[PDB]
Design a binder for this molecule. Structure first.
Ligand SMILES: Cc1ncc(COP(=O)(O)O)c(CN[C@@H](CCC(=O)O)C(=O)O)c1O
Ligand SMILES: Cc1ncc(COP(=O)(O)O)c(C=O)c1O
Lengths: 398, 398
């Protein structure tokens, strides 16, 4: 009911229309070996924004395992609800993830479905000894969690703090009995991570329940690829829950809920018996589950340390050549902030035309005037790939 | 409007724990040809509650096409949001669905994701010319839609009418400018159907936006399996939107949105640019997409009229032997009501020891004291499987 808002919707559709007109959005492109993309005219670009940080999207062992699972089981999924029955492949997949993370792990269609199934239940208090907690959302929490604040609000009090405002979180932890912090482990489209040491300290003093989105941490950091939180925490406690994706880094499909300690079946029961995607939404298909089992084996092999070393070496190379948000960290997300959406779109079109695709984030993905290009470092990037990108990038000024 | 977590679970958990203790829930069973289930004991039972209505989860053409799609792409999926780019396999799949339904159709990883991506946007008025409509939910609309009422309540007024209370709906239409009705085309429980003629009449008179869930309507009902709504409407219009899942009946994986007319990209653009699962939640992997393309080809061929006829034949054979709720309906869902939650778990455990699994519905899945056995007729069932089951159902002495 505002003219100031329809003025924004018109400015909005113009940028979206420009991104399609410029070919940086809506392109139909074929996957090509080397983290590259092929257009119908034959021209191939290097994907600077692929979220397969370990290059496991091109792993022949994962692909063959997915094919073998479909051939042996001769079915795509199950023909009944999960609460009813499970295929043996599913239990092998979750047992493998449980061995890897060292916790009780369930599979879902997506990390989004994991949030839909967990966040409203954590807010109800059934996961916090019958005490409904104060759900504290970080401002930069991914919208698969932030869009569900209203669901959490119907159950308890929902507060949103500024990005990594640890001070404010303590005030809520002091003034309130039970509190939960809903955040991302690492923050994409930004060079920021979660304050694990401060958050852990608040957890020891006030019993703060910690809800992390490990989507851009799984496989990237830590032994066995367990991620950023489990590399600092060591072993999961009864007050820390993780959700993540398995299509990025892990090299598979779907998402997962890391409930907590593997000896406690209570959190899994409560969420499974709750009205959510874990009860009513379909399970991962036989190809995906076969991929998860193979990728889990590779995470226990000597290959994962090698893939992580090549990634962090590639990050070091990039940071030594291009100045981006997060320069110095060990996360594979590097955001090139340009402010203007016109500059961001024009830069993506220049790079894409010169052999490098970098995804453009504007007004709906990021705040207005905070536009920029989201580069993502992968282990499957060659040295020449990064060195050549920096060359093309610096030919624009900035 | 809301859909809050059930806090009192002593009665519920006793029923869940009993179901798992008696093996009717939480069992690890292998899929076997003929719509059958293998156990660690080696015991084989017929699945009487399988959602694969046309038996397409055992079609070798669909499985081969899923394997072929993965062998030729050598990646499970692309590594970017579908806004940035898509594989040609995804465009071929959504074009294939578009030809079948005769509408603009997008795919997601589940029907639940399709609901998350549409209902909040429909409640904002962006789909109805900027006028926020009154969101009118049916009481027995599936919970993947009903759980998001709080999201819709942030954008407009939400109300829930009694099941198929068309007179109460018509009253809501007279009192407001724009109204939208959210429901299922076919309801699993009760054997009821959406009152299409009253709804189409209200759509003509008031402009009632219609939002159908077709998870149990696609494939099983209508010419070319286009569903119950499209078979009566013929050609979709500007004020009708469908969501459905493609793993039950359709024989594939994931879900879909049927936006509206196929020559109109306005609805797709609005939703694709909204902050929802269609933007940020992973696309279907290449096996699922290959399955959708093949399944779409089958639905256009003379194999769908066959499978629909073998289903209606098997439905009639079942209705002549076993007296169940819905007897006489053309929907392949039947309720063997037993009232006692305890006796429902006993019947399911007895039938499953004798070779016929029927999933037990108890509280909270169904109202207390209204427990039943939910059977699903499939075209993959043999006349022997149906008559042999009717024998075991009467030897039980129900
Ligand atoms: C931090 C975070 N959490 C959750 C999700 C959702 O996980 P799903 O398993 O895909 O539901 C994403 C996806 N953000 C991706 C987009 C993913 C895609 O659409 O392919 C990104 O923008 O890199 C994410 O970046
Ligand atoms: C009527 C109905 N709608 C929606 C869904 C959602 O299914 P899915 O999220 O697995 O695609 C289902 C699942 O039970 C359903 O039966």
């Amino acid at each position: 009911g505002s003219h100031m808002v329809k003025k924004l919707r018109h400015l909005s559709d113009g940028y979206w229309d420009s991104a399609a007109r410029l070919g940086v959005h809506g392109a139909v492109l074929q996957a090509v070996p080397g983290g590259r993309l092929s257009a119908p005219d034959g021209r191939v670009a290097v994907n600077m924004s692929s979220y397969s940080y370990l290059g496991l999207d091109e792993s022949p062992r994962i692909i063959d395992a997915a094919i073998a699972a479909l051939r042996s089981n001769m079915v795509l999924n199950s023909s009944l609800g999960r609460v009813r029955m499970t295929l043996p492949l599913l239990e092998e997949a979750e047992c493998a993830l449980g061995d890897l993370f060292g916790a009780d792990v369930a599979t879902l269609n997506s990390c989004s479905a994991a949030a839909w199934a967990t966040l409203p239940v954590l807010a109800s208090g059934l996961l916090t000894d019958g005490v409904a907690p104060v759900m504290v959302f970080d401002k930069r929490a991914h919208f698969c969690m932030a869009s569900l604040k209203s669901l959490c609000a119907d159950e308890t009090r929902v507060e949103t703090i500024r990005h990594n405002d640890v001070d404010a979180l303590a005030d809520i932890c002091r003034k309130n009995k039970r509190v939960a912090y809903v955040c991302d482990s690492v923050y994409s489209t930004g060079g920021t991570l979660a304050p694990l040491e401060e958050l852990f300290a608040l957890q020891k003093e006030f019993g703060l329940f910690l809800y992390f989105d490990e989507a851009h941490s799984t496989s990237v950091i830590g032994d066995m690829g367990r991620g950023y939180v489990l590399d600092r925490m060591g072993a999961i406690n009864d007050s820390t829950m993780l959700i993540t994706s398995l299509n990025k880094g892990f090299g598979a499909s779907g998402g997962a809920i890391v409930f907590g300690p593997r000896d406690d079946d209570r959190k899994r029961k409560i969420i499974q018996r709750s009205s959510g995607p874990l009860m009513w939404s379909q399970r991962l298909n036989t190809p995906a589950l076969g991929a998860i089992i193979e990728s889990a084996k590779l995470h226990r092999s000597e290959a994962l340390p090698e893939l992580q070393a090549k990634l962090h070496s590639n990050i070091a190379l990039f940071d030594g050549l291009v100045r981006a948000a997060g320069q110095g960290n060990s996360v594979p997300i590097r955001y090139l902030e340009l402010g203007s959406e016109v500059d961001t779109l024009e830069a993506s079109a220049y790079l894409f035309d010169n052999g490098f695709y970098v995804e453009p984030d504007f007004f709906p993905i990021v705040s207005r005037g905070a536009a920029g290009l989201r580069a993502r470092i992968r282990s499957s990037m060659s040295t020449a790939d990064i060195e050549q990108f920096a060359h093309v990038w610096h030919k624009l000024g900035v």
